[model samples]
Target: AAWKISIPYVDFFEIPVFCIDVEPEHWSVYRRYLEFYVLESKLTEFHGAFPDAQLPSKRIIGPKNYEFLKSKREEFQEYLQKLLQHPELSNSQLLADFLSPN
Candidate 1:
C-alpha cells in the first residue's frame, strides 16, 4: 500500500514504502534477518544435539562473510523459512512480520 500526504482540500504524492521490497540492500538485510531468526531459534538446540557445529557469533558481522552468505542466501533463506514454520519457531512475531512480504 502507498501512503498519502494530503492537506485539507489537496493531495500530495502517494509514496511507497513497499518499494524497498526490491532494493538490493533491503534484500540483503532480509536475508540476514531470516538467518538470524533461524540461528536464534535453533542454533543452541542443534549445538545441544550435534556438538561439532559451532554457532556463529554474528550472521552478517563482516563484509567478507556477508558477501559469502549472499552466494548461498536464497537457498538458506528457503530452508530457514521452512524451519521457521514449525510451531515452536513460529512464535516469533517479529520474524513473522519481517518475512510476511517474502
Candidate 2:
C-alpha cells in the first residue's frame, strides 16, 4: 500500500529477461515495482467484480470498501509469497529482491 509506481521503473522492468542486461540494483527496483504492478492489476479486477470499488483519482474514499480491499490484499500477499518461492525464477535476482523481507 505504500508504493506508487515509478514511471521510470515501469519500462525498466517490463522487458523480457533474456532480452535485457540488468544489474542487481535494477532488479531491486524491478522487484518492488512488480509487486505494486501485480496488485494494481488485481485492483482493476476487484473493481470489475464490484463496480463501486474503483479507486478515486485523488485521495481514496473507501469507507465500506475497506473490508473488501483488505481481504483481497491478503489474498494477493499469499499469492506473491508462493510466487517468490517458485522454482522457475529461482536464479533470478529480481526474484531474490521480490522475496526480500523488506
Candidate 3:
C-alpha cells in the first residue's frame, strides 16, 4: 500500500477499483472531507478506522475545502502518529494515512 504520490492515496484505493468504479461507497468518503470539509463531522471518524495504515509522504494533495481545511490538515498529521505508533499495521496504516486529513 506504499503510495508514491502523497497523502490520501489509500483513501482513493480503499474499496478497490471495483468499488470506486462500480459502487464508489468508499470514494464517497472523499467528498465528505474534500468537498464539504466537515470538521467534527466524519474526517476524524474515518481517521481512526485503520490502526496501522502507512503514510505516503509528508506532502499532501487535497480537493481543498476552504471552511474546514484546517481540520482536514490536522487529520493528516494524526494519521502520521498512528503510523509511527503502530508500524505493524503497515498495510492498513497505508490506507489510514492516505485517507488522513490533508
Candidates, ranked, TM-score:
1, 2, 3
Model 3 deviation from the true structure expressed as Cα RMSD, one decimal place: 11.4
Best by TM-score: 1
The whole-model lDDT of each prediction reads 0.36, 0.34, 0.36
Candidate 3, residues 1-102, lDDT tens digits: the string is 332222332333332111111121323223233332232224335445343443233335454334333334445545444444543434554344334433
Superior candidate under TM-score, 1 versus 3: 1
Candidate 1, residues 1-102, lDDT tens digits: the string is 111111111111231111113221233122332345455455445433222232334444443343345444444434444444444444555434444443
Question: After TM-score superposition, what is the CA distance of residue 44 in candidate 3 from its true location, in Å?
Answer: 13
TM values, all candidates: 0.34, 0.31, 0.27
TM-score of 2: 0.31
Worst 10 residues of 2 by lDDT: 1-10
Clashes of 3: 10
lDDT of 2 by residue, 1-102 (tens): 121212221222233111111331432232332344444455444332223322223223333343433334444444444443444434545434443432
